[PDB]
């Protein structure tokens, strides 16, 4: 009946001034816009239909046309920034916010969804949704004793939309909006549904992607133990954002990093650092590199948890992007570690795999590796054992490469390779 209408017939129906004819035509539009293959979004916009759809959001006496128009506009707003802008320019933001309080749950949910698409376009539309007052009624839908009494789909949509209000930078979301959202977000982060958990983690990951003050707002709400629990989930859609959030947190202060350590995160890293998904191994090694940039007692907990052999492993064999993070994690460790800690690296086997990476093209990794070598020699000097290391380096072919490096385009490489050979190998 409403299947495969032409845009021309939708227009005729919308312009009829018969509400039921307008309802049928709006449903026909909704069905066109629901097709996965090339939904005709631009044809519908060019036909002038957005302002009519927006007026239909206010027809309290015809809840079906409210729903159909909300759905049609949701799918326009799911497109490009220009398509979303057409929806915003039609006045849809305050109309959708008014539908959040609708007694019809499927209409409230459709408005939640449309607002998630609008906010997800970017910081400006996100902040415009906030300025029109969306947060209070969104949060009111979740102000229940137990989230389990809400329909699963409704809760997933609310969580996803809140995650878009937490997303994006330049600027980050308004501080007061984040503070308003965080208590509800922390409750969603303890919910049992895997999609709610994943999107809650994504939201926390966005909130911790920023200066230490933004990290602190999140950490102060006590979410780190739950993040560490979710870091062990079986579902990779959960582990991935949990790990991003943990990784972001440990870019903060040593004291913020310590909360991650105290919550038990390091015991998960044997698995993360061998995870068969290369993105997880990479992000876990990046996280490690910001932990080994910490205090000596935090390096020591890395040692105690058995993680140095895992770093030797990634350096020996991993995707090249992961090996780069591993080189950074080692340089940081050698930069801040005690002499005993740095010696331990050599005993675990760091030298050979580090040398084998001096044959790579990326000039930045070579600078990183060379910096670590110096730090390691400097620690050996304090024990008088520079030759033993020089031997080690010779026997795995490292000196060959360090020498070939004397003649490499970059000049910081030049200088570094030269000083090592002059100072330790003559």
């Amino acid at each position: 009946g409403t299947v495969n209408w032409s845009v021309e017939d939708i227009v005729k129906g919308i312009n009829s001034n018969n509400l039921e004819s307008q309802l049928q035509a709006t449903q026909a539009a909704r069905k066109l816009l629901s097709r996965e293959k090339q939904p005709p979004i631009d044809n519908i916009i060019r036909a002038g239909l957005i302002p009519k759809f927006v007026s239909f959001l206010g027809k309290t006496d015809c809840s079906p046309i409210q729903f159909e128009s909300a759905w049609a506009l949701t799918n326009i707003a799911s497109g490009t920034s220009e398509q979303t802008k057409a929806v915003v320019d039609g006045g849809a933001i305050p109309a959708f916010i008014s539908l959040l309080a609708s007694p019809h749950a499927h209409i409230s949910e459709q408005a939640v969804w449309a607002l998630g698409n609008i906010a997800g376009d970017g910081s400006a539309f996100r902040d415009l949704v906030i300025k029109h007052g969306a947060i209070d009624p969104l949060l009111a839908l979740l102000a229940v004793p137990d989230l389990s009494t809400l329909a699963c789909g409704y809760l997933r949509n609310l969580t996803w939309t809140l995650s878009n209000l937490c997303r994006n930078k330049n600027p980050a979301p308004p501080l007061d909006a984040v503070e308003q959202i965080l208590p509800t977000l922390v409750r969603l982060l303890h919910h049992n549904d895997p999609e709610v958990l994943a999107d809650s983690c994504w939201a926390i990951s966005y909130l911790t992607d920023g200066p230490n003050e933004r990290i602190e707002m999140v950490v102060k709400k006590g979410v780190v133990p739950q993040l560490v629990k979710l870091l062990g989930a079986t579902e990779l859609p959960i582990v991935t954002p949990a790990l991003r959030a943990i990784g972001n947190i440990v870019t903060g202060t040593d004291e913020q990093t310590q909360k991650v350590i105290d919550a038990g995160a390091l015991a998960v890293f044997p698995s993360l650092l061998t995870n068969p998904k290369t993105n997880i191994q990479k992000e876990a090694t990046w996280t490690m590199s910001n932990i080994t940039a910490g205090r000596q007692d935090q390096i020591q907990q890395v040692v105690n948890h058995g993680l140095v052999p895992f770093l030797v492993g990634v350096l020996s064999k991993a995707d090249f992007k992961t090996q780069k993070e591993a080189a950074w994690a080692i340089t940081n460790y050698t930069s801040g570690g005690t002499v005993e800690q740095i010696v331990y690296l050599v005993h675990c086997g760091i030298i050979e795999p580090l040398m084998n990476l001096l044959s790579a093209k990326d000039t930045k990794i070579i600078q990183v590796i060379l910096d670590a070598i110096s730090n390691i020699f400097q620690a050996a000097e304090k024990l008088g054992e520079t030759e033993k290391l020089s031997i080690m380096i010779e026997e795995c072919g490292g000196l060959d490469k360090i020498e070939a490096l004397q003649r490499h385009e970059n000049e910081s490489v030049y200088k570094a390779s030269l000083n090592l050979i002059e100072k330790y190998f003559s």
């Binding site: 629901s34 097709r35 996965e36 939904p39 759905w71 949701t74 799918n75 707003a77 799911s78 497109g79 979303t84 459709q110 969804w113 998630g116 698409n117 997800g120 376009d121 996803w160 995650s163 878009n164 997303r167 994943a198 999107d199 994504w202 990779l236 859609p237 991935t240 954002p241 998904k277 993105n279």
Partner: peptide, 13 residues
């Protein structure tokens, strides 16, 4: 393979 958030979502049903 990398898991990523969903920026916008079309409602197909």
């Amino acid at each position: 393979f990398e898991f990523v958030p969903n920026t916008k979502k079309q409602k197909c049903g």
